[PDB]
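> tool_call: predict_assembly(chains=two)
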Amino acid sequence: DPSLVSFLTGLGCPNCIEYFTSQGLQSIYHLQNLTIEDLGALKIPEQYRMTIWRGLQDLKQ
Amino acid sequence: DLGKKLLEAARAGQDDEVRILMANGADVNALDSWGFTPLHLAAFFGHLEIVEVLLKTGADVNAVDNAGTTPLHLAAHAGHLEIVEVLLKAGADVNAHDHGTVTPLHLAAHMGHLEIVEVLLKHGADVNAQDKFGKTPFDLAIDNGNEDIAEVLQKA
């Protein structure tokens, strides 16, 4: 889904997209409720992990 | 409403409905909840005839979504060479960058799109552009073992 491509582009880690799509997570909706623990389980390098997590929290209300 | 149905038609490749909905009063630059325009969606999903119809009808070639991504970003990522060429001819910003400071060339490099990498280079794409994590198009072509692109990116 372009929302996931665009999200990761906006954050600076387009190279992180395969960590999500390899688990069949295709859209920003599919990420919205992942935990810090979940992002580690996906084997996202710590370089990028918390940047992605904060980005997901910024989308919530 | 008209704008939502136009975004849906552009995504889905429904070229008649795209033409009809705009004539009926859909804004060519209607937004979805991510800030995508119909042009963003047509560019990502490879619908060249729809890209052309939207540009003719006044689509903003450099529209940014809520994360600062342009149609050229999406077409380059998705490997749609004919769309990338049509957007560049229509004045797409070759080095558009967002917070992440990621350019279309970064995405073409990462996804292994050789011909798009070359076309972007020919329109003055910045080989020196670093993302927020200091990675250049070159860095992402290496990290992904895209050898031909990494090569062409040194070549400039």
